[PDB]
Symmetry: D2
Subunit: 312 residues, 4 copies
């Protein structure tokens, strides 16, 4: 199995990504680390604990990371994930899954420096603040990581701005750090995740798993669906598990190696992932961008993970 660290900001689709990573046997989930983004750090961390309580995730540390972007002001997304960050779910008075005492940045560094070289894939699905901080605090992690597979970016059409995707937009400086390090980066951007639609058939399949964790996922996906239908005129785009799915089986999506850099100073374009598709593409390009999704394979992976989790 592939060892990963899942760095996230749950977040309704982050929650699905946690359960895909936990339920799929090709993934060894070493840690869930949280970052400010969809909601404040306090809220997304509580949300990660709720997901772990729901699915019975034991032995996987949950560590809270950065509560602010590197440079820019905090921006949250309650219009998409709700004031709580998980729609209309309710919370227990106390969580079974306790928080790790280590800052996420410290846990990321410790895991990378103590595991064998080239064995851990970083899977960020929120802003890149923790990843950037870790890379600058312990530069030896950059060559030691297997690769980075992140949900974020967009070649053309944004969501947080006309041209920028939310995870990059909320911390462009951190994204610039990650994309300009020498490690291999796979950008699973909106071009790809716009295809990860929670169609009625998908929601029906989740309902038919017939477990409490699947009921939980269906509940938050039904909230997420109403927001996307109302605010965006589409079915809900379940972005973040696409990054975990690539690690499970890269044939779940096509990719193209192209140069990618992060715009920091544009008036209209700050937070854009600027991609260069012009001919010729440079050789030994360390960045690749995802393009076409195997829709059936993707949702089969999500459903299979929910089936394997069962009713803990």
């Amino acid at each position: 199995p592939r060892k990963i660290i899942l760095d996230c900001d749950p977040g309704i689709d982050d929650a699905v990504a946690i359960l895909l990573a936990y339920g799929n046997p090709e993934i060894e989930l070493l840690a869930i680390t949280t970052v400010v983004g969809n909601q404040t750090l306090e809220k997304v961390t509580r949300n990660a604990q709720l997901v772990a309580d729901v699915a019975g995730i034991v032995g996987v540390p949950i560590a809270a990371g950065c509560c602010k972007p590197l440079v820019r002001k905090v921006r949250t997304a309650p219009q998409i994930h709700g004031e709580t960050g998980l729609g209309t779910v309710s919370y227990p008075s106390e969580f079974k899954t306790k928080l790790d005492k280590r800052h996420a940045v410290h846990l990321i560094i410790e895991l990378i420096m103590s595991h064998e070289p080239k064995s851990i894939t970083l899977v960020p699905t929120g802003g890149l603040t923790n990843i950037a901080m870790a890379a600058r605090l312990e530069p030896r992690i950059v060559e030691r990581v297997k690769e980075v597979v992140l949900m974020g970016g967009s070649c053309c059409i944004g969501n947080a701005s006309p041209v920028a995707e939310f995870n990059i937009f909320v911390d462009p400086e951190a994204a610039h750090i990650v994309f300009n390090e020498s490690w291999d980066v796979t950008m699973v951007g909106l071009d790809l995740t716009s295809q990860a639609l929670a169609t009625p058939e998908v929601l029906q399949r989740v309902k038919e798993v017939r477990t409490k964790p699947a009921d939980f996922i269906l509940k938050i996906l039904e909230f997420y669906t109403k927001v996307y239908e109302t605010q965006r005129n589409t079915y809900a785009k379940v972005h973040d598990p696409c990054a975990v799915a690539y690690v499970i089986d890269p044939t779940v999506m096509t990719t193209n190696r192209v140069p990618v850099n992060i715009e920091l100073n544009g008036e209209l374009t700050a937070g854009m992932t600027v991609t260069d598709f012009r001919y010729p593409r440079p050789e030994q390009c360390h960045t690749q961008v995802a393009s076409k999704l195997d829709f059936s394979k993707y949702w089969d992976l999500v459903i299979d993970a929910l089936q394997r989790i069962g009713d803990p």
Copy 2:
């Protein structure tokens, strides 16, 4: 017929656009105005005169405009259009078509203020310097123009930069002026013109027109083809007549009304046409962007214009 002013920087595809505008009976070509861009102003103006000499264009003033962009340094494209701006053609010792004494900006203003309101379409196919200058020198032209239909811009993939198209890139400030005036603007960008391919069948049809102007077009298109095949790994994209074709018959391409603005200060993205496709689109949007080309109709229009010009 629709009256137009064709503002251009010939330029191999500009030359095709001149002949489409001249040969098609739905266009009343009022003037050919030139601007620095593909080559220096002196060269592109001589090239416009050569095209007029080749096709026997009489009674249409050719006026030279701005020799520098508004703010940024002159950038030419000899790697695409040759050191002369028209590939390997030869020039007569003297042109039959003489240059108008008026600066292009003055001719544009004079034509718009003397013709009936809402009767003239501006068709820019180079940098937007002359159009911007005219709008600022005589602001009354903005409401008097029928509309602006320009070749330029790109929603996603650029040519002059990863994300910017040449005509916008060479004078972003002038583009910002044009796109932020109240007149209707149709942006016939690279998304559209990347489909205007000079395939072998197209070049064969040009050869079979069997006229000296068609031979001229075939010659410059064969140069243009070798440059695109070598530098870009595609057939040649014959961009500029797409803007004239829209004026002839808007059903030759689909369009979408979306907000468009011009990035001026990005490190990576200066010169980008930033388009906002997010839902919901604003009402009464004064900009629209072209999307899908009717390939057969487009090339039929070009071939028909060459047939109608005949051998003058």
Copy 3:
């Protein structure tokens, strides 16, 4: 005498500059051209006509120029010059001084191309829009002008922003055009004009000229004084005649030749005149920046001009 074109946006200190240029025998005032800035173009043009009516200026064309900056939105300064642009003065039902039929940009070009080379100094005391437009529409004026002496800019402390001075701030693109042309430019910036204080002794000297034009100047300077005392905690800074004064007698101020460029894209610094005082200064630098004012000589020039105008 030195021929000048005074390009301005009256504007209380512009009005003083008009009368200094008109009254001083070392200046041959060829034209008053107006630009949007302190107020709308309509208002500052009416204000120029009022100044000409008050002082009996005959045979000097007043031509209205650009009503918008090149790229950025119109910004006016009614908090400094009043809703009318001249404080609380009243206007006649009809002006004696009629407006020239030519756009200011056309008049500037015509004057420069018809007078002997190197004989006319351009003296801008508003935004640089007209000057930039003229330079781009007829590039031959750049080498034909004697030099440009402008009121604008600041090495350190701004007024319109922390670091930018108003005339540059309201059209940074036009300033960038002017400062990057090859002509000699003298920047009479806030470092200098902050010393041009209308102290009680100065206002007393204006009162003692005992003419109707001096009464007019005293009236607008008393408004200007109340605004500066209230909003800025200083006496009024009478900036614009400093540029005319340099043309009369360059020993009225010290200058330093240093590179100067215009910031266009900074979030905080757009509109800054970026000056490079670091050692070593380049040779044959075409820009110089004013530093120390001969306070007594400056106000003696203003008072002498008012005395020479007398009561027309």
Copy 4:
């Protein structure tokens, strides 16, 4: 005495600042932390060890921090501090002063969280990378610090660029983090430190201390002098001890409370400390900028520290 952490990049004037902090009895020097800047991190850290060996500094941890700026590329200053970072001094085969095992960022956080609140002043005299990293990794340090007194910035004239000072220029993002946190910041910028001249009388006083550490300081100051005389046409500006001197005795310099922010995106002005001196100044402004130096008091403090260190 005032507890400080001296964060620095020795650096010839940093070396003087270390000895002022060590020798003056009003300072309790808790740590010397190093950052990339004047030279690579490896070199400036070795240089800090050499200074500690020369002056016999025991019981003060030296901890190496960040080897790269947050976002931008490494920039060093061998033209000012030499290829080694300390001019032409020689190095022992082994240092007596050993390096702390903790990263500087970890040591800064540990010291602030373990000492009483509001007892430690941070004194950065290099790029602000470590300070910014510490503030983001443990946000509780921001309210716990007494204040930040840094050498960096400039109101008007820069050194690394026309308008930017080196320490801000080499990591503008880190500076933006520091200046936009709620802690009190005193900016001891070039306006102030340009007055800290190593005149012949100053160098003579250093020579007359007649100790090996003073000989060391004289040697590096003589190199520093030759660089400033040759490259800058001034005596050497000994910047960094000015920040320590303010902590010893704030009356050694005047200050003004004014808003200060950091320009990140300007083409010409990135790295500028943008100061707002316009009237009125906001109340309870958390930033102040140094202005006039008590030259005699400043150099008396430096000489007295060298005398107190003696010959260890």
